[PDB]
């Protein structure tokens, strides 16, 4: 019935072909390695032997490559068939990236809006799948009933780089997470296996997730008044002195340490964590 | 009908005081600031005027002071009451602090079990407190139809250290959480309010912290073979180009990147994230 034309058959890019080839769509695939990846031929895939050919098969081109430079050379010898073309680029990258991208496609005759996939492949088509969207609003809403088999939508206005800017800060969280649980993991070792530790430490920051929204709270009243930075401080060291002695890296937690620092410096161990805010800047 | 004997009425003792007196026991406090802090006379808790009328009120002894210096300095006129009481210390420190005061205290007649509090006070008395408990099995084993009031009890074995071992593992845990709060949420600040952001971290952080149980698995099994370690450090540099642009510091992802960039050297570049447990060593 309704058609579209995908770029990148990595684990994301299979997932996202799969998907629209399930929801009965037609669909043409540009595999970067043939030879060894699978182009979905036995689901009803067709292949796109060049970029042209990928660019024509369908008027919605979604791209899914390992990079921004790597989106530029694939489409390099295509440029001229651009035109009426709508493209939606959910490749990784950073705002600028995306605001040189979008100006350069609309020099072309095309429309565009970038997106940030906040999840696994294996996630593709759950209920739990979130896809971030910046740029054309009217690319957007037309492109919205096809993207929706994909993930739920949030479209978040028409820089072609907001999507982006939330993108990577997702992942800046996420990475905070992940250095959590490898400092947390690391100094238990010796005592108890990873697995078992679980049973303690995913309640907990279950618990401490939940403590945030109150810190976000504190950071858009300006309040942050009430322990404190100061008995915080105390904290860090124990962390510290306590990962020294059982021969575990402390690095994680050390540009903590110094933010804390620099806080109680111009007056706040008596504020909260939201505190330190303004000190990020 | 039983009673108890507290020092300490900060924020967390004044919680643990309030909790026991409501359940009906008789309660003694000890208070650092009687002239500015509530003694809780009021509920019906007697004050301890000194260190040893404290340790003489009950058998039962719990301490929850800033840190373990000032345990030793609060107690140290009072060395000869210790015989047959039993000393529950909820105070914070490291591992050794806690095998050193153990020792201290069994040498002057005593029992002892050190515990982490892993709750704010707010959450004393709920489903949701949990205390981590080690050293002395009998005290513990007499001890737990009184501390069961505040909390679920954990007891994970004989050496006094091991309980604040897992109470600093789960703090570095929140500490990185924290970090990509901070991170995420300046990163973002310029676009979008904190309050309104958190619709987007807390689903987020929920999906990742379930993506950890995975992680634990591979670490137990030492497996680590599927997104791989080259792909990520690309993201983090576009986490830290995105950062200078929008003029927010980048040293909390820092750490990340060096331990990224060792295990890829020692030919890790194909493996998860869960491979970094070894270099963390």
């Known amino acids: 019935m309704s058609s579209v034309s995908i770029f990148g058959l990595g684990a994301m890019g299979t997932a996202l072909a799969s998907r629209f080839l399930e929801e009965k769509y037609k669909v043409a695939v540009w595999n970067r390695s043939p030879e060894k990846a699978s182009s979905l031929l036995g689901k009803g895939a067709t292949l796109s032997h060049t970029a042209v050919d990928g660019i024509n098969a369908s008027d919605l081109i979604i791209i899914c490559l390992l990079d921004n430079a790597a989106v530029e050379a694939t489409l390099a010898g295509a440029l001229d068939h651009l035109h009426g073309k709508t493209i939606i680029n ?4 950073t705002p600028d990236q995306a605001r040189k991208l979008s100006d350069r496609f609309v020099s072309h005759g095309a429309r565009y809006v ?3 996939i906040m999840a696994t492949p294996s996630m593709i088509g759950s209920p739990y799948a979130l896809v971030l969207y910046s740029g054309s609003p009217d690319a957007f809403k037309a ?13 978040l206005g028409e820089d072609a780089g907001t999507a982006s800017l939330h993108d990577l800060a997702l992942l800046s969280g996420m990475y905070g997470l992940f250095s959590g649980f ?7 070792r010796s005592s108890t296996p990873a697995v078992k530790f679980m049973d303690l430490l995913v309640p907990w920051l279950g618990a401490m997730t939940e403590y945030t929204k109150g810190m976000a709270k504190q950071i858009d009243e300006g309040k942050y008044t009430s322990s404190n930075l100061a008995m915080q401080l105390v904290g860090i060291q124990n962390i510290i002195d306590a990962s020294e002695a059982q021969q575990v890296s402390a690095e994680f937690i050390r540009p903590m340490k110094e933010f804390m620092q620099k806080a109680v410096a111009a ?15």
Do not use: M, P, Q, W
Request: glycine fraction near 16%.
């Open 114 to 116: 970038h997106g940030g």
């Open 143 to 155: 492109a919205e009933g096809d993207l929706s088999v994909l993930a739920k939508c949030v479209f």
């Open 182 to 188: 490898l400092h947390a993991t690391a100094l238990v």
């Open 267 to 281: 007056g706040h161990g008596g504020d909260d964590i939201s505190s330190l805010i303004d000190f990020v800047k």
């Open 90 to 93: 959910l490749t990784n990258g």
